[PDB]
């Protein structure tokens with residue numbers, strides 16, 4: 052369970068992401084795909100992309116970036132009271148998309164990497180610790196829901 056102080060560090064760096072969610076989502080997905088190429092296979096619409104240039108030019112990858120960060124943003128803003136937001140998400144990612152928790156760990160890593168690079172103003176060690184806490188919470192609660200749904204994760 053995060054403190055209010057920890058939530059405010061999360062939400063301060065989020066506020067910067069929101070200046071340009073599409074740009075941040077491009078960087079974050081590209082980092083994910085570069086770091087764990089196996090994750091790209093889950094995206095039938097753009098899993099053929101071969102290079103970072105291709106990725107940066109893909110309108111479909113850009114939309115996905117906006118989707119993930121907007122959904123995550125809405126979750127973070129709930130400050131742990133995210134049961135409603137996680138229901139649909141766990142169901143789709145468990146049952147349709149088939150995303151293991153380890154891939155949720157991979158995108159969490161990419162999120163932290165990009166924020167650390169982009170936002171040294173709002174992503175010092177304390178803020179990064181708070182964001183890691185929030186993302187662990189997210190992954191813990193998703194994992195519990197996956198189990199409920201019958202998915203090993």
Ligand code: HEM
Pocket residue numbers: 090091093094095118119122123139140143144148150154155158
């Ligand atoms: C912070 C983590 C994540 C959040 C908040 C998130 C949220 C979403 C949302 C809102 C959608 C669209 C609605 C839906 O289908 O449920 C979506 C679709 C999808 N997500 Fe995620 N997601 C996350 C992580 C992942 C990861 C790590 C992968 C794969 C490695 C993944 C694969 C997909 C796929 C394949 C789709 C369908 C996209 C499409 O067909 O257009 N997601 N995700």
